[PDB]
């Protein structure tokens, strides 16, 4: 089994009002699948739902293994997130889906920061009017790294706002 191993494993999560846990907010997150190779990644993509057809209040999380998509995580405590607001038989993939796929491929391929790790995960959030893409890093003090992430994220996307936020 000649597989193409990744630099890091990555876990996918999905949440929505149907997964909303009124008692414990944390359990609202549902881990779906962990990927360790390019092939596993593309199988995951195969069985993921496109954002064009995804529910109005849903979020995909994609984070390094052993790293929860929450600030309380030690990997995200000091860092922050750089995010942007995109806009809305068989049909061609939408630019939103294409940008989502490009950012995921850049994440697993480790060319989101071409130089401990700096990028800890990413989050796509389907909202009412906007669609929030977010890259969660680990060190909010690294200015050069955030600028490098800015150019990279702008490259891998082609679908209104860009904001960095420390947690």
């Amino acid at each position: 089994a000649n597989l193409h191993k990744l630099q890091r494993a990555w876990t996918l999560w999905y949440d929505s009002p149907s997964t909303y846990n009124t008692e414990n907010w944390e359990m609202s997150l549902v881990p779906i699948m962990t990927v360790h190779s390019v092939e596993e990644f593309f199988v995951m993509l195969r069985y993921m739902k496109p954002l064009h057809a995804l529910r109005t209040s849903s979020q995909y999380h994609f984070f390094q293994e052993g790293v929860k998509p929450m600030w309380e995580d030690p990997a995200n405590k000091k860092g922050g997130k750089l995010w942007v607001n995109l806009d809305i038989a068989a049909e061609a993939k939408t630019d939103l889906d294409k940008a989502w796929e490009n950012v995921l491929m850049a994440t697993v391929g480790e060319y989101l920061d071409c130089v401990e790790p700096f990028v800890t995960g990413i989050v796509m959030s389907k909202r009412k009017y906007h669609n929030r893409l977010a890259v969660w890093v680990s060190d909010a003090s690294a200015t050069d790294k955030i600028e490098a992430l800015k150019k990279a994220l702008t490259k891998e996307a082609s679908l209104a706002s860009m904001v960095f936020t420390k947690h």
Binding site: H4, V30, M33, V43, K49, A53, M105, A106, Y111
Partner: protein, 40 residues
């Protein structure tokens, strides 16, 4: 100096990926993802 791939390299390896699938254990967890409802 780490395991890196390019976008085109990943898209090439996707052809190999096409030969692999998922069992019911890992595949059932994708059911949580919900399709948007219609607007009549």
């Amino acid at each position: 100096v780490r395991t890196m791939y390019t976008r085109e390299e990943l898209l090439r390896i996707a052809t190999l990926a096409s030969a692999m699938d998922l069992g019911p254990e890992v595949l059932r967890k994708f059911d949580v993802i919900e399709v948007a409802e219609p607007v009549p």
